[PDB]
Enzyme design. Structure first.
Site, mmCIF file in Angstrom:
data_model
loop_
_atom_site.group_PDB
_atom_site.id
_atom_site.type_symbol
_atom_site.label_atom_id
_atom_site.label_comp_id
_atom_site.label_asym_id
_atom_site.label_seq_id
_atom_site.Cartn_x
_atom_site.Cartn_y
_atom_site.Cartn_z
ATOM 1 N N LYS A 78 43.618 45.709 32.499
ATOM 2 C CA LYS A 78 43.435 47.060 33.020
ATOM 3 C C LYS A 78 43.956 48.091 32.023
ATOM 4 C CE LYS A 78 43.788 49.105 37.530
ATOM 5 N NZ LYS A 78 44.523 48.839 38.792
ATOM 6 N N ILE A 90 34.142 45.323 33.746
ATOM 7 C CA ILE A 90 33.952 44.986 35.165
ATOM 8 C C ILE A 90 34.335 46.098 36.145
ATOM 9 C CG2 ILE A 90 33.946 42.435 35.087
ATOM 10 C CD1 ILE A 90 36.988 42.509 35.528
ATOM 11 N N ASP A 148 45.046 51.759 51.134
ATOM 12 C CA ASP A 148 43.646 51.831 50.715
ATOM 13 C C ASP A 148 42.968 50.464 50.677
ATOM 14 O OD1 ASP A 148 41.283 53.203 49.908
ATOM 15 O OD2 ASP A 148 41.766 52.853 47.779
ATOM 16 N N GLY A 168 37.513 53.376 36.379
ATOM 17 C CA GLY A 168 38.549 54.154 37.061
ATOM 18 C C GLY A 168 38.870 55.462 36.356
ATOM 19 N N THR A 169 39.585 56.342 37.057
ATOM 20 C CA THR A 169 40.040 57.610 36.480
ATOM 21 C C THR A 169 41.199 57.342 35.522
ATOM 22 O OG1 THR A 169 39.542 58.605 38.652
ATOM 23 C CG2 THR A 169 40.566 60.041 36.999
HETATM 24 C C1 PO5 Z 1 30.887 46.896 42.654
HETATM 25 N N1 PO5 Z 1 30.750 46.002 41.473
HETATM 26 C C2 PO5 Z 1 30.060 46.660 40.336
HETATM 27 C C3 PO5 Z 1 32.038 45.384 41.063
HETATM 28 C C4 PO5 Z 1 31.776 44.113 40.276
HETATM 29 O O1 PO5 Z 1 31.347 43.065 41.140
HETATM 30 C C5 PO5 Z 1 33.065 43.667 39.625
HETATM 31 O O2 PO5 Z 1 34.106 43.802 40.585
HETATM 32 C C6 PO5 Z 1 35.169 43.032 40.157
HETATM 33 C C7 PO5 Z 1 36.389 43.156 40.779
HETATM 34 C C8 PO5 Z 1 37.453 42.396 40.350
HETATM 35 C C9 PO5 Z 1 37.318 41.520 39.298
HETATM 36 N N2 PO5 Z 1 38.424 40.758 38.891
HETATM 37 C C10 PO5 Z 1 39.764 41.121 39.083
HETATM 38 N N3 PO5 Z 1 40.620 40.104 39.213
HETATM 39 C C11 PO5 Z 1 41.902 40.421 39.391
HETATM 40 C C12 PO5 Z 1 42.370 41.709 39.443
HETATM 41 C C13 PO5 Z 1 41.415 42.682 39.298
HETATM 42 C C14 PO5 Z 1 41.825 44.061 39.328
HETATM 43 C C15 PO5 Z 1 43.096 44.635 39.095
HETATM 44 N N4 PO5 Z 1 43.072 45.967 39.185
HETATM 45 N N5 PO5 Z 1 41.793 46.250 39.480
HETATM 46 N N6 PO5 Z 1 41.401 47.520 39.635
HETATM 47 C C16 PO5 Z 1 40.144 47.688 39.914
HETATM 48 N N7 PO5 Z 1 39.638 48.954 40.090
HETATM 49 C C17 PO5 Z 1 39.409 49.505 41.419
HETATM 50 C C18 PO5 Z 1 39.543 51.014 41.356
HETATM 51 O O3 PO5 Z 1 38.693 51.523 40.323
HETATM 52 C C19 PO5 Z 1 39.168 51.095 39.050
HETATM 53 C C20 PO5 Z 1 38.961 49.601 38.971
HETATM 54 C C21 PO5 Z 1 39.182 46.570 40.051
HETATM 55 C C22 PO5 Z 1 39.658 45.337 39.874
HETATM 56 C C23 PO5 Z 1 41.008 45.139 39.573
HETATM 57 N N8 PO5 Z 1 40.119 42.412 39.114
HETATM 58 C C24 PO5 Z 1 36.089 41.408 38.685
HETATM 59 C C25 PO5 Z 1 35.013 42.159 39.104
#
Ligand code: PO5
Lengths: 257, 292
Positions: free
Chosen positions: B33, B10, B124, B13-14
């Site tokens: 993560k 989903i 951010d 990240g770096t």
């Molecule tokens: C644009 N689209 C393709 C995105 C999609 O719709 C899919 O986006 C999403 C986004 C969130 C979810 N769920 C979720 N729940 C709780 C916590 C987290 C979460 C915790 N740390 N990070 N770091 C992240 N990061 C942010 C920085 O980069 C590394 C990942 C992205 C999400 C999360 N994520 C599921 C899907």
């Protein structure tokens, strides 16, 4: 503004949760207060060498103390704890922390890179990733906002006194950061301007001047005996025009308490 | 680590990859993560874990566990279904209803007010970092660039370009809570307009876009501005535009709150705590979104 009071109250609550066990040094079979004094002073040097923030130093000390609070460590390995703690603080607090190789290099290669990284890993486990500790430095910067107006010498001196506290586990492990900072700030304020622990801060902290006395008495002695002390890095550091050469200011003979 | 069945990737990240996952023993759905490990544990990981451990709030994402092995490092989060950015695109035609925009902002400001009250800057905030579920909850996520103050947080020489506050762009030595309010300000407007408020393609372009909308700041409106490191006397002097032309669908309260969130001087910009009592939230409710 609207958050300042809550942040104080919060650091107050957290400083109790992040204090080391006061009498841990008595249960460490192979290290003494003296050894730790050597270690923390060396870190002061490292902090100058790599031009790291003073917060980084205070944090590292807290990690070291908390670590030793539950982990027996041989003398030959004490510095390894010290190094990794310093690395972790740098990672937490600094914008661009020094590279691991730099933390290796400063130990005359006593430990490899493999060792430092593993110690970082172990400290993280032992501290259970709980790195955001309240520090004397943190409480001083809060207390500084209660100056009328801000006095740079007072600030540098208070800082200097708070920093000195880090070196001597006896007696300073007896006191919470908020208390040491209070003692420090008053002593600096009294040395430089003559004024005392302000009414505003009494209300904020709840600490009366009378309640700061015990700690104040100890800090007064450290300030007095500063040029005789076996460790000297902090004094040298604060002779600098950066910190208004406060380590050269003559301590008051008595505190009129 | 053995209890987690990976369901679907989903995120990218770096530091590492994020997967949707489920607990094989308890059936709980989580966000895993992954962080790959030669500089030891990444600082952002250290910060994110440390600071989230403290912040327990319904409007901040909950870190459930940190699986800590010799070779890999995992962060277990409560799972949320999608981010705000995906919902904003899914809304592009129909638009997000005001009741829901109001709810989202209200909750965000509550999470943020909690962060600031525990000496934590987010630094951010952006649609991608804000997570929503199907029941109308919105939560602050990605605390990789989050930072503890109590010692003032110094600025580098980080943030996504569009949601950056002008004081940073102008080269201020320190951050403050004001930068998180600015971000939310931009996100607020964006939910209202269906367009990014200040979508600059470079630093100077970003600054100029802010100017054409709110006016070029002077000493009267912002004491010290013309002394700031990256200020230039040769900056075009634009006039402040009417907020009724910037955010048309917003009522007087909306425009009122928004302007205070996009206030130039950081010192006078509204705090999350104070924004919560603004007349705009007099009738706040908790509507549910429609998610695909
Ligand atoms: C644009 N689209 C393709 C995105 C999609 O719709 C899919 O986006 C999403 C986004 C969130 C979810 N769920 C979720 N729940 C709780 C916590 C987290 C979460 C915790 N740390 N990070 N770091 C992240 N990061 C942010 C920085 O980069 C590394 C990942 C992205 C999400 C999360 N994520 C599921 C899907």
């Amino acid at each position: 503004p609207d958050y300042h009071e809550d942040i104080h109250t919060y650091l107050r609550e957290m400083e109790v949760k992040c204090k080391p066990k006061v009498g841990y040094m008595k249960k460490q079979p192979d290290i003494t207060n003296s050894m730790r004094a050597i270690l923390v002073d060396w870190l002061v040097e490292v902090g100058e060498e790599y031009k790291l923030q003073n917060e980084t130093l205070h944090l590292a000390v807290n990690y070291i103390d908390r670590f030793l609070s539950s982990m027996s460590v041989l003398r030959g390995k004490l510095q390894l704890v010290g190094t990794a703690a310093m690395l972790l603080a740098s990672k937490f607090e600094e914008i661009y922390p020094p590279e691991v190789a730099e933390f290796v290099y400063i130990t005359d290669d006593t430990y490899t890179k493999k060792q430092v990284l593993r110690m970082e890993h172990l400290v993280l486990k032992v501290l259970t990733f709980d790195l955001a500790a309240p520090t004397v430095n943190q409480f001083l910067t809060q207390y500084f906002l209660h100056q009328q107006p801000a006095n740079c010498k007072v600030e540098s001196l208070a800082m200097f006194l708070g920093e000195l506290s880090l070196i001597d586990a006896d007696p300073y492990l007896k006191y919470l950061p908020s208390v040491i900072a209070g003692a420090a700030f008053h002593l600096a304020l009294y040395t430089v301007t003559g004024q005392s622990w302000p009414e505003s801060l009494i209300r904020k902290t709840g600490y009366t001047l009378e309640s700061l006395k015990p700690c104040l008495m100890d800090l007064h002695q450290t300030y007095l005996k500063a040029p005789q002390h076996a460790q000297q890095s902090i004094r040298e550091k604060y002779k600098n025009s950066k910190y208004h050469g406060v380590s050269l200011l003559n301590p008051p003979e008595t505190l009129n308490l | 680590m053995e209890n987690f069945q990976k369901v679907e990737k989903i995120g990218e990240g770096t530091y590492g990859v994020v997967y949707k996952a489920r607990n094989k023993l308890t059936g709980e759905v989580v966000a895993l993560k992954k962080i790959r490990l030669t500089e030891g544990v990444p600082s952002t990981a250290i910060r994110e874990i440390s600071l989230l451990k403290e912040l327990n709030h319904p409007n901040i994402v909950k870190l459930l566990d940190v699986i800590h092995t010799e070779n890999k490092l995992y962060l277990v989060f409560e799972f949320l279904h999608q981010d705000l950015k995906k919902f904003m695109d899914a809304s592009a035609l129909t638009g997000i209803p005001l009741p829901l925009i109001k709810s989202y902002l209200f909750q965000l400001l509550q999470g943020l007010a909690f962060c600031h009250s525990h000496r934590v800057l987010h630094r951010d905030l952006k649609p991608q970092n804000l997570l929503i579920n199907t029941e109308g909850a919105i939560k602050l996520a990605d605390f990789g660039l989050a930072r503890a103050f109590g010692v003032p947080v110094r600025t580098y020489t980080v943030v996504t370009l569009w949601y950056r506050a002008p004081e940073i762009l102008l080269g201020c030595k320190y951050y403050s809570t004001a930068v998180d309010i600015w971000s939310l300000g931009c996100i607020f407007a964006e939910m209202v307009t269906r367009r990014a408020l200040f979508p600059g393609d470079s630093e100077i372009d970003q600054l100029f876009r802010i100017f054409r909308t709110l006016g070029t700041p002077d000493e009267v409106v912002w004491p010290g501005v013309t002394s700031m490191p990256d200020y230039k006397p040769s900056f075009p002097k634009w006039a402040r535009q009417d907020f009724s032309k910037v955010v048309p669908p917003l009522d007087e309260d909306g425009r009122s709150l928004l302007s205070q969130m996009l206030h130039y001087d950081p010192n006078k910009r509204i705090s999350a705590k104070a924004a919560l009592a603004h007349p705009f939230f007099q009738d706040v409710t908790k509507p549910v979104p429609h998610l695909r």
